[PDB]
Enzyme design. Structure first.
Site, mmCIF file in Angstrom:
data_model
loop_
_atom_site.group_PDB
_atom_site.id
_atom_site.type_symbol
_atom_site.label_atom_id
_atom_site.label_comp_id
_atom_site.label_asym_id
_atom_site.label_seq_id
_atom_site.Cartn_x
_atom_site.Cartn_y
_atom_site.Cartn_z
ATOM 1 N N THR A 148 -4.149 7.152 1.739
ATOM 2 C CA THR A 148 -3.211 7.490 2.791
ATOM 3 C C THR A 148 -3.937 8.369 3.819
ATOM 4 O OG1 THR A 148 -1.263 7.279 1.357
ATOM 5 C CG2 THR A 148 -1.031 8.644 3.295
ATOM 6 N N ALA A 171 -12.975 1.236 -1.674
ATOM 7 C CA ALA A 171 -13.214 0.324 -2.781
ATOM 8 C C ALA A 171 -11.927 -0.142 -3.468
ATOM 9 C CB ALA A 171 -14.149 0.967 -3.783
ATOM 10 N N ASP A 197 -9.231 -0.634 -6.228
ATOM 11 C CA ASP A 197 -8.763 0.332 -7.226
ATOM 12 C C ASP A 197 -7.441 -0.101 -7.905
ATOM 13 O OD1 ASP A 197 -9.182 2.662 -8.668
ATOM 14 O OD2 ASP A 197 -9.648 3.821 -6.841
ATOM 15 N N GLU A 233 6.906 9.987 -1.163
ATOM 16 C CA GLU A 233 6.387 11.122 -0.413
ATOM 17 C C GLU A 233 7.548 11.761 0.327
ATOM 18 O OE1 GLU A 233 3.816 13.006 0.768
ATOM 19 O OE2 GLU A 233 2.111 12.299 -0.427
ATOM 20 N N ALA A 234 7.656 13.083 0.262
ATOM 21 C CA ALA A 234 8.616 13.795 1.100
ATOM 22 C C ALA A 234 7.839 14.450 2.244
ATOM 23 C CB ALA A 234 9.375 14.818 0.289
ATOM 24 N N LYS A 292 15.320 12.751 5.428
ATOM 25 C CA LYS A 292 15.288 14.012 4.651
ATOM 26 C C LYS A 292 15.755 15.222 5.472
ATOM 27 C CE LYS A 292 12.236 17.368 2.429
ATOM 28 N NZ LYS A 292 10.878 18.020 2.526
ATOM 29 N N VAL A 328 -19.000 3.088 -2.951
ATOM 30 C CA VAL A 328 -20.139 3.982 -2.680
ATOM 31 C C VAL A 328 -21.087 3.980 -3.861
ATOM 32 C CG1 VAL A 328 -20.955 6.349 -2.412
ATOM 33 C CG2 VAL A 328 -18.990 5.596 -1.097
ATOM 34 N N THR A 332 4.172 19.261 1.413
ATOM 35 C CA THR A 332 3.015 19.536 2.264
ATOM 36 C C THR A 332 1.863 18.539 2.125
ATOM 37 O OG1 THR A 332 2.223 21.080 0.571
ATOM 38 C CG2 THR A 332 3.406 21.999 2.490
ATOM 39 N N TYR A 369 9.192 22.373 15.902
ATOM 40 C CA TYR A 369 8.623 21.133 15.368
ATOM 41 C C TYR A 369 7.887 20.331 16.479
ATOM 42 C CZ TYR A 369 11.340 22.250 11.144
ATOM 43 O OH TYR A 369 11.816 22.877 10.016
#
Lengths: 527, 527
Positions: A15, A39, A41, A49-50, A79, A197, A359, A455
């Site tokens: 992300t 790569a 995964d 996610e908040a 939210k 890598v 966060t 904000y």
């Protein structure tokens, strides 16, 4: 005049990987060649996610992507707060608010800022009256409109689209990262390479020369951005920069998380993230469309992975033997420096704290903001790196302190975990902040009480990130209050008399919006 | 709940004394009995005070005294900038600007905030062009309207009251101090008592109990405000709190000043303060009505009192043997702590720096704002005291660092004085700003470029006291520029295209205001 930064390599396509690419790609459009390298995964489950309202203004706005476009694409819910359940009452991990002093045991930490009344925040007046027995109402219901319409699952936006509060978003972070991969590679010409890598080559000054993949390709750059997550394959592994573990303030370091199908037609959609207290940690709940992400953040020193799985499973009535679960071991803390040489760390390769205050993504764009602000030329001015690193560590440490205070001032004593949190020390700086709060002060009060300017101007919502509104929500919520009211209110009798007019404005607005707002379920249905 | 502050005693009736009395008189109105203790001192000439635009918004607005009311009463003039004469060229102490690259050796530090172009300060754009030989214009003329009308002495207000720039005031300190003594005593029930301090009585907690005057009276209060100036009758002499001499950063300690009759109709009035560089210091010029204050600030380490009198008198063509002069030995520095126990310090008893950046009065109302904000009850919580001392400490040291940079970064080397300022070290915090500045970065850039919002909300204008615009005016003015342009600018070809129409805007606004504005004389005459 020295050489500008020509060619950038981002190792990691998570992300943070793709956010760095979108943001860097649009900020250096046409003047920099960006290549991301990620790569294959085992994907994790979308556990959710908040976020925080400036995701739109500090990040999507900078890219040029309308809020409704990406919200519709990634099927995000809205939210308005974090509802903290069962942090004041003893007992097992349950999704059910226990009983405390008449009503349920919860409090809301909501977005937005307290109203100022004659240059003093509403909180101070509330506590004055609470202390002189002129009220018994919880800080959150007295000072905020939100807790009432949230109790009733109301929408932050009216049916026509008008906004009645500050809000953020819930989403599967995978879907958003997919959105940003398409955007970055299609509209900003970031070059995607699927490769692993294999070796990083350093020069004589200890900087990164080139990174070589498993297929033998070699990539070289001016600036390397490490977005490889907890592995820190560039910043830690290649550059040999130490990660400062910080479990002397945060006990939690593990999680067990899943995704749960949910009937929106029957129970509606919750316009808040729920932080639910367990016996050896807490559990998130992040409402989505027909889904909700949930995860038990525990401390591995007070519960085994087995115990955490059945604690987490029992509370949601899930089958441990058949429910797909992710088991994570977190890297709690941060790099000693985020940026060394030509290597800049973005995302969990840089720092990480449990998601108790949403966060996660904030750290990524806040850092990407900071990186552009402090952007180098090929000479790599050390002043630029120094100051950048300084913003990143005060950003991280401040939040580490704020989150620790969620456990420190919990009244619970019922498990070794809750009693263990009380033996920890607050940082000297968090310690100074509590002393201030007890003296009846505001902590980091906003420059203005205008929710939009805060904000909206990201330079303002960074320098003053954890403000007085948040500290009262969490600390007054947990039940820690000043020793006595703010000494000023005893000298402002016009103000204390005329305050109940503002306390009644929130009471009026709670009541009007409670019966003038569509369920968040209804609003989402329209989108 | 513990006792409020009932009684305050202010010792000292200067400008600081009566500002303190008026401020606290209005802030704690009806809820505290304030008494002031001034005794007669040898009166001084009116040599002038320069101010800063938030004197109206942070102080007088708070008192509820409109601008036109106190400006008329105290026969004040208007201030738009500080013009810096002869700071870059060698030579005697003259009132005439010498030559320097085909123009007068002068530069302006004005009051506006520098415009943002794509959330980058205009200063970064001007230096970009300077470095790439695209321009050759000085920073102040490029980026501010102010110099072009200040060169023609025009008024910051049109004849119809309308305001076209940020402005502050020039005035006799005495007339403002007496205006406030009337206002305090008359309209806020402050008790003026004419008496001299004989004895200060402390308790075993080292707090002041009472002060006993020479007439034999004792005054007791819960809180004591020391406004006794350099003598520091309470904070230094009673409480024995040490003073920090700052002379490893600030060489100026002496000064010789007078007031000069001016024929306004013949020459007009200057809409600015002048800072004229001398051989062993600098001379202020503060225009008033029919008068101008003037004072040579000097370093006793490099000029004797007589040499300073000769140099100053010759400069203005006055008789050293007949001209009324004030000879002053300053106390430069600050206390180790501004507030100890129940004893708070305001004015020159707290700290003092030479008046190069017009901070004398600012420091008084800044500290009062902070005293009210951090105001105690009888328990005298230490956190309030410390956090107060913390703000007063950074407000001073910042300003000290900034003042020192005026002398440090001057190109002059002609006199012992100017050479010696370069052997002094900058404070570590100042060096970091200088490092940043050279790295292309802004120093303390303001959240917004709205000069009204800045000089309006005092909490913003204090937190961001010396901002990027201030630093650029003084540093660029003296000729200190960054090592190479802001690296971001190379990745912003569209921005660097479009600043053309922003520098173009200052040029229209300069030309349009020069031909449509009246002279400060024409406006003061009308008022």
């Amino acid at each position: 005049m020295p050489g500008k930064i020509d060619k950038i390599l981002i190792v990691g396509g998570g992300t943070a990987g793709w956010m760095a690419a979108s943001y860097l790609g649009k900020a250096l459009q046409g003047t920099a060649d960006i290549t991301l390298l990620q790569a294959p995964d085992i994907p994790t489950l979308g556990v959710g996610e908040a976020t925080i309202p400036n995701l739109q203004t500090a990040f999507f706005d900078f890219l040029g992507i309308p809020e409704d476009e990406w919200v519709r694409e990634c099927n995000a819910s809205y939210k308005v707060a974090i509802k903290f359940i069962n942090w004041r009452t003893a007992g097992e991990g349950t999704s059910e608010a226990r009983e405390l002093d008449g009503g349920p045991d919860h409090f809301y930490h909501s977005f937005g800022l307290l109203k100022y009344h004659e240059q003093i925040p509403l909180s101070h007046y509330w506590f004055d009256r609470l202390y002189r027995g002129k009220t018994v109402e919880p800080f959150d219901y007295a000072c905020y409109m939100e807790p009432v319409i949230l109790d009733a699952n109301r929408s932050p936006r009216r049916l026509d689209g008008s906004k009645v509060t500050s809000y953020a978003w819930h989403f599967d972070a995978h879907l958003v990262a997919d959105f940003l991969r398409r955007f970055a590679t299609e509209k900003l010409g970031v070059r995607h390479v699927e490769d692993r890598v294999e070796h990083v080559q350093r020069d004589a000054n200890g900087n990164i020369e080139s990174v070589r993949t498993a297929t033998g390709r070699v990539f070289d750059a001016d600036l390397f951005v490490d977005c490889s997550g907890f592995r820190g394959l560039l910043i830690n592994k290649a550059m040999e920069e130490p990660f400062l573990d910080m479990s002397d303030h945060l006990l939690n370091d593990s999680a067990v998380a899943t995704q749960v199908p949910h009937d929106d037609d029957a129970n509606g959609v919750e316009p808040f993230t729920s932080a639910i207290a367990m016996k050896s940690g807490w559990t998130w709940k992040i409402p989505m469309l027909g889904r909700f992400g949930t995860g038990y953040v525990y401390s591995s020193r007070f519960a085994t992975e087995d115990e955490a799985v059945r604690e987490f499973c029992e509370m949601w009535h899930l089958d441990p033997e058949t429910q797909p679960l992710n088991r994570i071991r977190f890297r709690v803390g941060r790099n000693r420096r985020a940026w060394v040489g030509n290597c800049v760390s973005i995302g969990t390769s840089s720092c990480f704290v449990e998601p108790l205050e949403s966060t996660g993504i904030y750290f990524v764009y806040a850092a990407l903001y900071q990186l552009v602000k402090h952007f180098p030329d090929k000479s790599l001015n050390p002043v630029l790196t120094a100051r950048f690193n300084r913003e990143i560590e005060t950003m991280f440490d401040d939040t580490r302190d704020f989150i620790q205070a969620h456990f420190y001032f919990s009244p619970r004593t019922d498990t070794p975990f809750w009693r263990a949190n009380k033996d920890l020390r607050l940082a000297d700086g968090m310690q100074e902040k509590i002393d201030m709060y007890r003296a009846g002060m505001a902590i980091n009060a906003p420059a203005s009480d205008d929710a939009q300017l805060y904000y909206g101007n990201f330079e303002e919502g960074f320098r003053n990130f954890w403000n007085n509104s948040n500290y009262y929500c969490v600390l007054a919520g947990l039940g820690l209050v000043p020793d006595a009211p703010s000494p000023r209110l005893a000298h402002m009798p016009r103000a204390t008399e005329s305050v109940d007019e503002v306390f009644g404005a929130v009471k009026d607005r709670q009541r009007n919006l409670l019966e003038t707002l569509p369920s968040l379920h209804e609003f989402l249905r329209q989108q």
